[PDB]
Design a protein around this ligand. Structure first.
Ligand code: VVI
Length: 289
């Protein structure tokens, strides 16, 4: 509740709109986010507390806000724009990504005799590689800021109107010591399927456990938004991970990209690439195509 003049934004310059998801996130119009253009409208996302409002919920949002302030700006993350902390409910104002999360972006754009482009879907291989590259660059930035994501997944990458990838929800209290591994979200997601083995079995989280998750995200990309470990119940996932099993190479995926996935899933975190190495490896592919 103390005033931070660097980040404080007058709440009466916000017009809240339709909710985006559930703290909870609401789309809003902001006037004068740029103090040089005080009447200029922009669209932003506003994170706020739900109606439940427990003291732990508030602490978690305040903690997220403080991570937001120190992370700095990067093109491939959702950036803090401002906060409302005085004379009203706590708002954390961040960039809005017009096309939604990357999983929904891909699933809505899967390939399909009217006109000359009947076989042509919206998604091409170089653009998919660019999505992976941009996520790696954002993750590399986050890692250099000493930010571990802990649930990196296509659902947590957002897509701007210009198809820029932005990592979202990176500075969050994740309830690491009480994960319901069998928990399925309302959209059917089993988040345990993105956890590195050292995170799942030992509750150990490093930038290399994020590299594991990036490998799963790579698989999501090149299945155009498929769900990982298809048809493997959580009980069976435990055992196959204990046996060293990995996902198969997805169809229409070049061996360069499945190779990168398998590196990302090496048992020993030291045998996985760094994000810096993933950026370079992906840059080489992007340039070649
Ligand atoms: C604003 O440009 C805008 N955004 C969206 N969709 C959208 O998802 N915007 C969005 C959402 C954000 O977080 C939410 C909670 C979210 C969702 Cl909805 C789904 N998956 C992950 C997450 Cl984290 C954030 C953030 N932080 C930023 N932007 C529109 O959809 C129609 C429309 C508009 Br104008």
């Amino acid at each position: 509740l103390p005033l931070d003049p660097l980040w404080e934004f007058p709440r009466d310059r916000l017009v809240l709109g339709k909710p985006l998801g559930e703290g909870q996130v609401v789309r809003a119009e902001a006037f004068g986010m740029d103090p040089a253009r005080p009447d200029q409208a922009s669209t932003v996302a506003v994170k706020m507390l739900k109606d439940n409002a427990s003291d732990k919920d508030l602490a978690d949002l305040v903690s997220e806000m403080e991570v937001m302030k120190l992370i700095g700006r990067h093109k491939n993350i959702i950036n803090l724009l401002g906060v409302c902390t005085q004379e009203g409910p706590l708002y954390v104002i961040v960039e809005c990504a017009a096309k939604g999360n990357l999983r929904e972006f891909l699933r809505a754009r899967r390939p399909p005799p009217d006109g000359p482009r009947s076989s042509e879907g919206p998604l091409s291989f170089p653009v998919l590689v660019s999505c992976a590259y941009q996520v790696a660059r954002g993750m590399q930035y986050l890692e250099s800021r000493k930010c571990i994501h802990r649930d990196l997944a296509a659902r947590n990458v957002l897509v701007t109107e210009d198809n820029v990838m932005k990592i979202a929800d990176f500075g969050l209290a994740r309830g690491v010591h009480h994960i319901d591994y069998y928990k399925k979200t309302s959209n059917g997601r089993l988040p345990v399927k993105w956890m590195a083995p050292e995170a799942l079995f030992d509750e150990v989280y490093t930038h290399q456990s994020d590299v594991w998750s990036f490998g799963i995200l790579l698989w999501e990309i090149f299945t155009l938004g498929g769900s990982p470990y298809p048809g493997i119940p959580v009980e069976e996932l435990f055992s196959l991970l204990r046996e060293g099993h990995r996902m198969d190479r997805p169809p229409h995926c070049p061996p360069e990209l499945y190779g990168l996935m398998r590196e990302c899933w090496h048992a020993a975190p030291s045998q996985r690439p760094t994000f810096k190495q993933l950026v370079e490896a992906l840059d080489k592919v992007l340039l070649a195509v």
